[PDB]
C-alpha cells in the first residue's frame, strides 16, 4: 500500500506524520519511507543528510530505526523542474511494490513530485490545523483531488478539537486530533522519530495511539 | 588517524567509547566508525541493524548523526575464523586513509579482527573499570601490546576515581574517569549516541567534557 502525505501549506506536520506513521507501521510491516521533499525533512528526522548527488529516484535506501528510508537528494530538484509525471509515477509504483507500506513525504506544493505521488497513491493523507491558511489549503486539495478522481483522509494537528469541513466531498476528515507537544520538537532536534523518543522519554507513552488510529483508518 | 578501541572483557564500555568519541570528533573532522564486532553494538547505537549479508570489509557505510558508520555484518564472523591478518590490516589502512579519524570498535577478545585493528592503529584506547576482571584484562592487554611493540591509552569508566596500574609500562592511564550515568542506558535504548541524546535531554550537558579530554589526549 502506497500512502502519500500531501499539503500545499508548509508547517502543518506533513513530515512529522510521514516519519511517525512509517515508524509505527514498521513495528509489524515491511515499511519504506520515500522522501520526495528536496529540503529532506524526513531524511533529517531519521538522522541522515540530504545527498548532494543527483541520484536516480529510489536507488538509495537505508534501514534506520526499523524503517527503509530513501534519503532526499538534489536530483529531486531537477525532477521538480524537468520531471515527466508518468515516469516518476511508474518509478514510485515499482518502489512501492517491494513494501507492505510505502509512506511518501512530499514538498509543500502540488507540483510534479506531489502530483506523481498522488496519482499512484493507494491512500492520500493530508494533515490540517485550525489555522485559516491550512483550511484554504485543504479546500484547494479537495479541488485537485476531484481533478484526478481520488479521495483523501485528513486529521487535525496542533489542536485539541477536530476540524471537519463537510463541503469538501473528496476529503474524509477523521476524528483524530494531535495536540501541541514539545516531544515533537525535542525528537526533531535529535533527528529521531517522536514515537521512538517518547518510548524512552516518558513513563506512559501517548503519541502511539494517534498513529495507531491513523493506521487503522487508512488500512480499511 | 586510526583510533582502535580494545578490551578482552565485555561490558566495560568499549562500544560506548567508540560511538561517543566518533560522534564528538565528527563535530569538526571527517570521522568514520568501523564496527568490527559481529554483535554490532556500535551499529545498533547508530540506529542500524547488523547486515545479514557476507559483505566485503569496509564496502558499506552510511552517514548517520554526522558519522560515517560501517555497519557490522555476518561476514565479520568468517573474517574472525579464516581472516588473514595482513589482508585485514591493509584493508583497514586503506579505509582509514579516507578519514581524518577512523574509530574502530572491536569484539571482546584479542582475536583476528582485534589484533588486525591494533597492528595498524595510530592510537589504541582501552577503557578500564575498578572491577578486578577489567584490571586482569588490562594486564593481559599490556602483555599483548609489548608483543606487537605498541602502546595504548586507558581511561576509567563506571567510576568516580581513576585507575592507574604503574606496572603496566605499555599502558598510559589518563586521569579521565566517567561515572555511572543513566543517560548512557537511555541513549543506548534509543540507539543514538549518548552525547547527542544529552544535547537535548538536559539543560547543561556534561558528558562532552570527558570525550573532549580523551580526544585531546590522543591527538597529541
Ligand atoms: N503536534 C505538534 N506539537 C508540537 N510541535 C509539532 C507538532 N507537529 C509538528 N510539530 C513541529 O512543527 C515543525 C514543523 O513540522 P513539519 O512536520 O516539519 O511540517 P511540514 O513537514 O508540514 O512542513 C517541526 O519542528 C515539528 O517538530
Ligand atoms: N558510564 C556509564 N554509566 C552507565 N552505563 C554505562 C556507562 N558506560 C556504558 N554503560 C552501559 O553499559 C552497557 C555496556 O556497555 P558497552 O559499551 O556495550 O560495553 P562493551 O562494548 O565493552 O561490551 C551499555 O548498555 C551501556 O549503555
Ligand atoms: Mg516537511
Ligand atoms: Mg561492544
Count Cα neighbours of B199 within 13 Å in the Cβ-side half-sphere: 17
C-alpha cell of residue A118: 498522488
Resolution of the solved structure (Å):
2.1
C-alpha cell of residue B20: 561517543
Q: Where are the alpha helices (DSSP H) in B27-57?
A: 41-45
DSSP code of residue B38: T
CA–CA distance, B112 with B116 (Å, rounded to integer): 6
A37 neighbors A106 (Cβ within 8 angstroms): yes
The CA-atom distances, in angstroms, between A91 and each of A15, A139, A183, B45, B88 are 21, 29, 35, 33, 40
Sheet holding A123-128, edge to edge: A62-64, A67-70, A31-35, A101-105, A2-5, A123-128, A152-157, A171-178
B101 neighbors B1 (Cβ within 8 angstroms): yes
Under DSSP, is residue B90 helix (H, G, I), strand (E, B) or coil? Answer: helix
**Sign of dihedral through CA atoms A150, A40, B104, B188?**
negative
CA–CA distance, A78 with B23 (Å, rounded to integer): 33
CA–CA distance, A124 with A218 (Å, rounded to integer): 9
CA–CA distance, B66 with A103 (Å, rounded to integer): 25
* Rg from Cα positions in chain B: 16
Report which protein residue has its CA nearest ligand 1's atom 8.
Answer: A13
CA–CA distance, B217 with B23 (Å, rounded to integer): 16
Strand partners, A64: A67
Q: Check if B205 contacts A (Cβ < 8 Å).
A: no
Residue B23: closest CA among B38, B3, B51: B3
Q: Check if A46 contacts B (Cβ < 8 Å).
A: yes
Residue B171: closest CA among B142, B213, B133, B128: B142
Return the residue matching grid coordinates 487503522. Answer: A216
Q: What's the angle, vertex CA A48, arms to CA A70 and CA A95, rounded to 5?
A: 5
Residue A175: closest CA among A213, A212, A209: A213
Residue B127 CB burial class (10 angstroms; 0-12, 13-18, ≥19): buried
A176 neighbors A156 (Cβ within 8 angstroms): yes
Query: CB neighbours of A18 closer than 8 A, spacing ≥ 6?
Result: A5, A33, A35, A42, A103, A104, A105
Count Cα neighbours of A72 within 13 Å in the Cβ-side half-sphere: 27
Angle between helices A112-119 and A75-82 (to 10 degrees): 80
Contact B191 A65 (CB under 8 A): yes
Under DSSP, is residue B58 helix (H, G, I), strand (E, B) or coil? Answer: coil
C-alpha cell of residue B141: 592487554
Distance B43 CA to ligand 4 centre (A): 10
**Per-position DSSP letters for B147-210, written without gaps between them:** HHT--EEEEEES-SS----TT-TTEEEEEEEE---HHHHHHHHHTS-HHHHHHHHSSS--HHHH
**Per-position DSSP letters for chain A, written without gaps between them:** -EEEE--SSTTSSHHHHHHHHHHHHHTTS-EEEEE--TT-HHHHHTT---BSS-PPTT---EEETTEEEE--BTHHHHHHHH--HHHHHHHHHHHHTT-SEEEEE--SSSSHHHHHHHHT-SEEEEEE-SSHHHHHHHHHHHHHHHHHT--EEEEEES-SS----TT-TTEEEEEEEE---HHHHHHHHHTS-HHHHHHHHSSS--HHHHHHHHHHHHH-
Residue B89: closest CA among B100, B104, B74: B104
The set of protein residues with a Cβ atom below 6 angstroms from ligand 1 is: A 7, 10-16, 41, 108, 157-158, 178, 180-181, 184-185, 188
Contact A200 B190 (CB under 8 A): yes
CA–CA distance, B185 with A200 (Å, rounded to integer): 10
Return the residue matching grid coordinates 547505537. Answer: B45
A194 neighbors A13 (Cβ within 8 angstroms): no
Distance B7 CA to ligand 1 centre (A): 43
Strand partners, B35: B105
Strand partners, B127: B155
Residue A199 CB burial class (10 angstroms; 0-12, 13-18, ≥19): middle
Residue A67 CB burial class (10 angstroms; 0-12, 13-18, ≥19): buried
Return the residue matching grid coordinates 536507488. Answer: A59
DSSP code of residue B56: P
Residue A7 CB burial class (10 angstroms; 0-12, 13-18, ≥19): buried
B169 neighbors B154 (Cβ within 8 angstroms): no
Report the 10 Å Cβ neighbour count for B111: 17
Phi, psi of B35 (to 5 degrees): -95, 105
The CA-atom distances, in angstroms, between B14 and each of A218, B21, B106, B211 are 45, 11, 8, 13
Q: What is the 3-state secondary structure (H, E, C) of A5-40?
A: ECCCCCCCCHHHHHHHHHHHHHCCCCEEEEECCCCC
Contact A62 B48 (CB under 8 A): yes
Q: What's the angle, vertex CA A95, arms to CA A93 and CA A98, rounded to 5?
A: 110
B158 neighbors B129 (Cβ within 8 angstroms): yes
CA–CA distance, B1 with B120 (Å, rounded to integer): 10
For strands A62-64 and A67-70, give the pairing: antiparallel
Q: Would you give the distance in Å from CA B167 to the centre of its chain? A: 24
Nearest CA in chain A to B65: A47
Strand partners, B154: B126, B173
Report which protein residue has its CA nearest ligand 2's atom 23.
Answer: B11
Contact A49 B63 (CB under 8 A): yes
Partner-chain residue, chosen from A62, A63, A196, that has the shortest CB–CB distance to B190: A196
Residue B5: closest CA among B101, B104, B90, B110: B104
C-alpha cell of residue B96: 582509514
Min distance B98 CA to chain A CA atoms (Å): 18
- E-only strand ranges, B61-109: 62-64, 67-70, 101-105
Report the 10 Å Cβ neighbour count for A34: 28
Find the Cα–Cα–Cα–Cα dihedral B12, A196, B31, A68, rounded to 10°.
120
| Interior/surface letters A91-101, b for 16+ CB within 10 angstroms, e for the rest | bbeebbeebeb
Query: Has A14 been labeled as part of a binding site?
Result: yes
**Sign of dihedral through CA atoms B129, B132, B134, B135?**
positive
Amino acid at each position: 500500500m502506497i500512502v502519500t502525505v500531501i499539503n500545499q501549506k508548509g508547517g502543518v506536520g506533513k513530515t512529522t506524520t510521514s516519519v511517525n506513521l512509517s515508524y509505527y507501521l514498521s513495528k509489524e510491516k515491511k515499511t519504506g519511507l520515500l522522501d520526495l521533499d528536496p529540503e529532506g525533512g524526513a531524511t533529517i528526522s531519521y538522522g541522515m543528510k540530504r545527498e548532494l548527488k543527483e541520484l536516480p529516484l529510489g536507488e538509495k535506501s537505508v534501514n534506520i530505526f526499523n524503517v527503509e528510508v530513501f534519503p532526499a537528494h538534489i536530483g529531486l530538484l531537477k525532477l521538480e523542474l524537468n520531471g515527466d509525471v508518468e515516469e516518476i509515477s511508474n518509478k514510485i509504483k515499482e518502489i512501492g511494490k517491494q513494501f507492505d507500506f510505502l509512506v511518501i513525504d512530499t514538498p509543500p506544493n502540488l507540483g510534479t513530485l506531489a502530483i506523481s505521488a498522488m496519482l499512484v497513491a493507494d491512500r492520500i493523507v493530508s494533515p490540517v490545523t485550525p489555522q485559516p491558511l491550512a483550511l484554504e489549503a485543504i479546500k484547494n486539495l479537495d479541488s485537485r483531488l476531484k481533478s484526478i478522481g481520488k479521495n483523501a483522509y485528513s486529521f487535525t494537528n496542533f489542536s485539541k478539537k477536530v476540524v471537519k469541513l463537510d463541503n469538501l466531498s473528496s476529503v474524509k476528515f477523521t476524528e483524530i486530533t494531535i495536540p501541541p507537544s514539545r516531544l515533537f520538537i525535542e525528537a526533531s532536534r535529535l533527528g529521531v522519530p517522536a514515537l521512538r523518543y517518547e518510548e524512552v522519554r516518558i513513563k506512559k507513552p501517548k503519541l502511539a495511539n494517534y498513529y495507531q488510529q491513523l493506521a487503522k483508518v487508512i488500512s480499511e
